[PDB]
Design a protein around this ligand. Structure first.
Ligand SMILES: [Ca+2]
Ligand SMILES: [Cu+2]
Ligand SMILES: [Cu+2]
Length: 228
């Protein structure tokens, strides 16, 4: 008698994000809480580094730190893979290649724990330059709008995504982060495998002036598009 799929997303849903990271041997954890509203495609989240100082720039973790909160227009609802997997959820895996620098590999479980949508991530960063833009903390505390191109992966009963994130560098240069993404449902329940489309993803980062801990406040608007 449980709610599944779209019915889990009719209103505002609480979100928990938990990440463990190891980048060039630097261990860290992140905890985020807030809420998602798939009716307007809006996310509001506050993140803290629970292990002290974050050894990489916050912007490099944004894509890793819940695409089930994307607004799918009424005419695109049958192409929403992300909600179709809920509540059992999906595994989201990425390779993120920073141009002229190291690579993040991520594995996340996105699923309901009671009434909360939880994103549980393990992140391994390898082959970073200790004096590069990432471990050297030379990325601006800001974020650009990006389109995430989604395609069905019928062999894996899931989806793939490819996109390049543009991180503004303090000297005015750009640090590219090439993303390779695959999502696989948890369990044997069938999912909706979409026609090619994209998620228009708009991100605003801010700081709480009263917060002493290493932290990131995030707002996102995400809208699916590209199907008629
Ligand atoms: Ca700048
Ligand atoms: Cu049920
Ligand atoms: Cu180091």
């Amino acid at each position: 008698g449980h709610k599944r799929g779209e019915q889990l997303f009719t209103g505002v849903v609480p979100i928990l994000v938990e990440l463990d990271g190891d980048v060039n041997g630097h261990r860290f954890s992140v905890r985020g809480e807030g809420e998602g509203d798939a009716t307007n495609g809006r996310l509001t989240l506050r993140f803290i580094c629970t292990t002290g100082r974050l050894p990489v720039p916050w912007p490099t973790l944004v894509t890793t730190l819940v695409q089930c909160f994307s607004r799918y227009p009424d005419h695109m609802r049958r192409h929403d893979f992300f909600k179709s997997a809920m509540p059992e959820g999906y595994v989201q895996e990425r390779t993120i290649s920073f141009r002229d620098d190291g690579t993040y590999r991520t594995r996340a479980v996105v699923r309901f724990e009671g009434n909360t949508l939880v994103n549980r991530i393990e992140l391994r960063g390898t082959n970073f330059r200790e004096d590069g833009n990432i471990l050297g903390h030379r990325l601006e505390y800001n974020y650009n709008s990006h389109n995430v191109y989604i395609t069905a992966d019928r062999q894996r009963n899931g989806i793939r995504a490819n996109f390049t994130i543009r991180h503004n560098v303090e000297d005015g240069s750009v640090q590219l982060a090439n993303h390779y993404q695959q999502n696989t449902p948890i369990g044997n329940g069938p999912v909706l495998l979409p026609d090619d489309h994209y998620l228009s993803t708009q991100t605003a980062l801010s700081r709480d002036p009263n917060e002493r801990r290493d932290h990131m406040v995030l707002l996102e608007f995400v809208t699916a598009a590209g199907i008629t």
